């Protein structure tokens, strides 16, 4: 990689390779994700993102996660980073949705992590929708996690007086 003359393309070929991952082995996959993250100057991105979303669908599937779960968390990390740099998009909205589906803490933690972050980040607009989304999600749901969720959000508050 310390061929820091680091050509565009090469980074790009990864996905192809990556496709192969669907024949799992997380551990390998995991190595990939880290590896993967790196190349992206917040670009070859979309095609990827899309692909990620594909992954995401794929991730849904019917699953009996045991290994891939892990991956997900990781992915999200990997993913997280990018965003920091980037301006990101709808894809993201989808996580929010996605997250609603889900049922385990670690994600909530991420989410929360996001809570924090976003709290810092504020360009805002999205949030509001999402807040709406959430409103649904929320209405649509119960749990400690949620319960907790409410608290912060509540804490947060703005309009629709």
């Amino acid at each position: 990689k310390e061929h820091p003359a680091h050509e565009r393309v090469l980074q790009d070929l990864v996905m192809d390779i990556l496709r192969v991952l669907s024949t799992p082995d997380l551990e390998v996959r995991k190595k990939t994700l880290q590896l993967a993250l790196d190349l992206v100057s917040s670009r070859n991105v979309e095609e990827l993102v899309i692909v990620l979303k594909k992954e995401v669908i794929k991730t849904n599937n019917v699953s009996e996660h045991e290994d891939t779960d892990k991956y997900r968390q990781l992915l999200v990390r990997t993913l997280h980073s990018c965003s920091v740099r980037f301006p990101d998009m709808a894809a993201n909205v989808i996580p929010v949705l996605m997250e609603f589906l889900s049922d385990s803490n670690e994600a909530a933690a991420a989410d929360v992590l996001e809570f924090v972050r976003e709290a810092i980040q504020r360009f805002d607009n999205l949030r509001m929708l999402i807040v709406e989304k959430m409103l649904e999600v929320f209405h649509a749901i119960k749990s400690v996690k949620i319960y907790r969720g409410a608290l912060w959000i509540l804490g947060e508050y703005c309009s629709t007086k």
């Binding site: 929360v112 924090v116 912060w152 804490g155």
Partner: protein, 112 residues
């Protein structure tokens, strides 16, 4: 004995009860450093909740102050402070609450 043992004799539930009681008692029985010493410990434990009691007990206490407390009482809330969002909030809020009344007044209303 209670303090120590309970610490390493566990059960959160006990703590609730005792907390509540202790909550009232404070500086009428002095021994500040120790008592502080304890109090810190009680908090030490995780649980936003476990942590929380030491502050609440404190309100009757703080207000009264003891063999050294008012100046310092003021200093302490500052020295000990926390994030963890709603745990953050607890610190912030108590503060914020604190922020909101002349602390002398503050003590009077809340206490009752």
């Amino acid at each position: 004995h209670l303090c120590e043992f309970i610490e390493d004799c566990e059960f959160t539930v006990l703590a609730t009860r005792i907390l509540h009681l202790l909550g009232q008692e404070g500086p009428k029985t002095n021994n500040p450093s120790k008592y502080i010493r304890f109090i810190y410990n009680r908090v030490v434990l995780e649980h936003e909740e476990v942590r929380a009691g030491a502050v609440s007990a404190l309100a009757k206490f703080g207000a009264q102050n003891e063999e050294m407390l008012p100046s310092i009482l003021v200093l302490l809330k500052r020295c000990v402070m926390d994030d963890d969002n709603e745990v953050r909030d607890r610190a912030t809020f108590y503060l914020n609450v604190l922020e909101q009344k002349q602390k002398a007044l503050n003590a009077g209303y809340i206490l009752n």
